Design a protein around this ligand. Sequence first.
Ligand SMILES: C[C@]12CCC(=O)C[C@@H]1CC[C@@H]1[C@@H]2CC[C@]2(C)[C@@H](O)CC[C@@H]12
Ligand SMILES: [Li+]
Length: 245
Amino acid sequence: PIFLNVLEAIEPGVVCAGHDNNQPDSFAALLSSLNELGERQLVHVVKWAKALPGFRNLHVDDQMAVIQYSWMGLMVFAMGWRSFTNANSRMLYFAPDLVFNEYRMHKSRMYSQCVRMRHLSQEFGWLQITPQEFLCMKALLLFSIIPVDGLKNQKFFDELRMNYIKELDRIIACKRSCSRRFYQLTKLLDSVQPIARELHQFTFDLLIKSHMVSVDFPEMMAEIISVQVPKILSGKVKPIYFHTQ
Ligand SMILES: C[C@]12CCC(=O)C[C@@H]1CC[C@@H]1[C@@H]2CC[C@]2(C)[C@@H](O)CC[C@@H]12
Ligand SMILES: [Li+]
């Protein structure tokens, strides 16, 4: 099982947010900390993606683009997973030093988004998702959002995505019905996209007004959110869904 060996080997470790838990919870502090966490995790997601089987088959411009479009969904999905394994989805485990209870969900003014994310975390429990399933699903999320007009070399992308789908199917097949399970997992993967879209909308709006509300955006975050995220929100870049929405 070369493929699973690899996904397991490359899986990023713990990333902390740098949040000061001594200071009262305020919108500005929580969101600055989440933004900082995003920047730190972005560094890990890039090194992760670059080490994925076949990823170097993509054109270099496409390597960068798939990361830039998919990071939100990937980070939300992994955060769901950590919340499940650490808090049993009772709280959102963004980082060891940044765990949201209901009060912080309220204070972050992202309560409805946090509800959807906690629901995804709950699905990990409800569907009894295995770590191997999680790892393959996560890899497939990197290949789940692309420009409507296609990438630089779409053929390389299509083939890579195909290979990852096949890998998910094998993992299900190697389990003690297959069809139900595949249906369940593709439905779960689809459910990440609407959550990612609401956070895309939220973060874009926040960047625009960030001076006003004293929320800090680090450099990579500000740039992707103003350059790449608007492509998604304007419909130039769209998620690939398994099932019809
Ligand atoms: C991806 C992050 C940070 C990484 C993580 O664990 C999930 C989480 C989901 C909400 C995001 C946050 C990064 C910063 C964002 C985008 C804020 O600007 C508003 C929503 C935040
Ligand atoms: Li705090």
